[PDB]
Structure formats: C-alpha cells, structure tokens
C-alpha cells in the first residue's frame, strides 16, 4: 500500500534499462519517471511526487551545472528529496567530495549488481548505504590524501621549513645534514606528493 | 634629538656587520641591539626600547618558531614594533606570504645596497617600503599563482569537468572533441600546474 516512489536519471538508456530491471524485482518500489539530461530532470522534479532520486554523477547539464555541482543544485532546491549517486568514477578524491554532500548513499556501476537493491533497502529503513568496494577505496587516501606513500618524518620536516621560507642551504644548516641529502629528501617528497616545481609545491602545502 | 631606535637580527655576523655600516651613515638611527638567534631576540625585546626590528626571514629558532611563523610570533607579541624583513629568498610565493603579514617592508639582501636606507626613510615618514626588484617578481605569479604560463580556456574547461567528477571519456562527449585531444589537453594543463597525477591534481584544484 505504501511504497517508495523513485526517479532515475542517467545519460545512457542501457543503464536506465538495467536499473529498471533491478527495481521491478522489488514490489515496494514504484518508478515515477526517468530522465537522460539534467535540464528535463530539474524541470520535472516539481511536477513529480518522488521520495528518492537515483542519478549519475557525470550527467550533462546545459543549465543547472555538471557533476558534483549538479548534485549540490538538486540538494539545495529539493531538500526533502533523498539522493543515491550512481557512478563509475572510482577516484577516491571524487568519491570523498561526493560524500561531503550528505546524500543518502553511493553505488558504483561496476560494483556488484546487488548493491543498488541494498541501497534502497537501507533507505527504506531511514538508513544510509555505503558498499565495501567504496569503503576500502577510501582507506587508500588514508594518508591525508597524499596517496599510498606517506612522507617520512625527515621528508615532512624539510617541506615544513621550505614552506616557512628557508632555502635548501638554510635547511641543511638548520637540520644538520648535507645539501645533497636535503635536495634528495625534497625531491623524494615532491615525488610522493605529485609536484614538479617549487611554486606548485608551495601552492600545494598552503592548503594542508 | 629624536631618532629611530633599531634592533637588527641575523644568523650571520657579516650581514650584521654590513647592516651596521649602512646604518651608521644615517645620523637619526640608533642601533640598540643585535642578535644571532630568535631566542635571544625574543627574550630581550621586552628589555629594549626599539621602534623597529630588521630581521632575517630564515633565522633559526629552537623555541619560538621558524621563518614566517617566527615573524607572526613577533607581530603578535610585540604589536607596536615595526618590522622590516631582510631575505635572500626571491621565490614569489614566499615573498607574497610574507607581505600578507602586514609588516612595514621587505628588502632583498642581493637587492641594491641603497634599498635598506630607503626602507628606513619610508618608515621614518610612517610609510611602507617595497623595492622594485620585489614588485616585478610579484608580477610574475600574476597568473593566479599558476606561474608564467596560464591555462588555455580549453585546458581550464577540461580540468573544471575533471574536478566535477567527469572521467576523460565523459569530457570528450560533453565537450565534443576526441579522447586523444582531451588527454593531451589534460596532460598539457597538468604540466603547467606542476602536477604529475590525478590525486595531486584534484587536491590542487580544491583550493583554487
């Protein structure tokens, strides 16, 4: 008698198809609309009584934004609406940015076919869902977002002093090691962070 | 009858010497102390009536901080005290960070021998001094701190979409160009920013 009205939005109709199959094997879900661009979605959301939107992260919007910004748009403008984000982007920084939006869950498209029905079941109990394929990928950028390889204490110290305005020769004195050592530790640290020059490095460090 | 009491602090005594020569050819300056480490400086500042401190950016502090942080310490703890920062670091990001401290001026050590007496003359009129050798170096990181080479509009767009969570193949579609083109523009843009991988890139962009 009381079921979850769902809207589904994706760029590609074979995805829209695949989701519709998964969801008609669930009696308490009613799909009340499907859309292939963000403009038709946004423009029809006021006309449709929906509890939840399942949507692609990377859907093309000519009006209301793209990607993460489009998800912010929707949250802000339809605040009662629960959102599950469906994506194929398994970059940790991207998945993390998404989760800072306080949406009701994330599902990877190449993650298990069972994840989407779990997401909705969690949501049907007022709960948020996060699959393990996502959980473990967020382990990764455990290291403060450096990546897998953390800075060594010595490496961190060198960069700390550079950021404070010391030139390499001054750091060698301050730390009592050779200039060949210091340059090698800086280089090594810059390699771990993904920076190729000092201005990029100093930019990098000023938000960290 | 009424003259500028100056304190001077540097790691190296040949600098302390050179400054003392420059300043005794100015009758209205009285040097009231000189120091070779930040700890003796800070600990004696309460005992000395000084209007201005001339100090090295990269002075070693075992207690009160290093570099830019040491300059913040001094500002915060001796707020009536005017500070001229003397340095050999001609990195623009460093000089810029320094100028955000609202100090009374900057002088480069390898900049003209006339700059230090100009700095004090400006300060004697209640004015702030900035030599042109510094002014032009700050032109450089005109480009929003990218460096000399700005991103092309096309390059900026590609990075905008990456940051929004689009994969390269999705960007090619969205922008209606080839994947070979998009990858080439991303690569090229990453090269201009000084980033070697996607996580470094996404970190970079989130504060810019």
Curated annotation (Swiss-Prot), chains A, B:
Belongs to the RcsB family. Keywords: DNA-binding, Phosphoprotein, Transcription, Transcription regulation, Two-component regulatory system. SUPFAM superfamilies: C-terminal effector domain of the bipartite response regulators, CheY-like. The keyword Nucleus does not apply. It comes from Salmonella typhimurium (strain LT2 / SGSC1412 / ATCC 700720). Phosphorylated and activated by RcsD. It comes from the Bacteria. PANTHER family: TRANSCRIPTIONAL REGULATORY PROTEIN RCSB, TWO-COMPONENT RESPONSE REGULATOR. Residues 144-208 form the HTH luxR-type domain. InterPro entries: CheY-like_superfamily, RcsB, Sig_transdc_resp-reg_C-effctor, Sig_transdc_resp-reg_receiver, Tscrpt_reg_LuxR_C, WalR-like, WH-like_DNA-bd_sf. Component of the Rcs signaling system, which controls transcription of numerous genes. RcsB is the response regulator that binds to regulatory DNA regions. Can function both in an RcsA-dependent or RcsA-independent manner. Gene3D superfamilies: 3.40.50.2300, Winged helix-like DNA-binding domain superfamily/Winged helix DNA-binding domain (1.10.10.10). This is Transcriptional regulatory protein RcsB. PROSITE patterns: HTH_LUXR_1, HTH_LUXR_2, RESPONSE_REGULATORY. The keyword Disulfide bond does not apply. GO terms for biological process: phosphorelay signal transduction system; regulation of DNA-templated transcription. Residues 168-187 bind DNA. The modification 4-aspartylphosphate is found at residue 56. Interacts with RcsD and RcsA. GO terms for molecular function: DNA binding. Residues 5-124 form the Response regulatory domain.
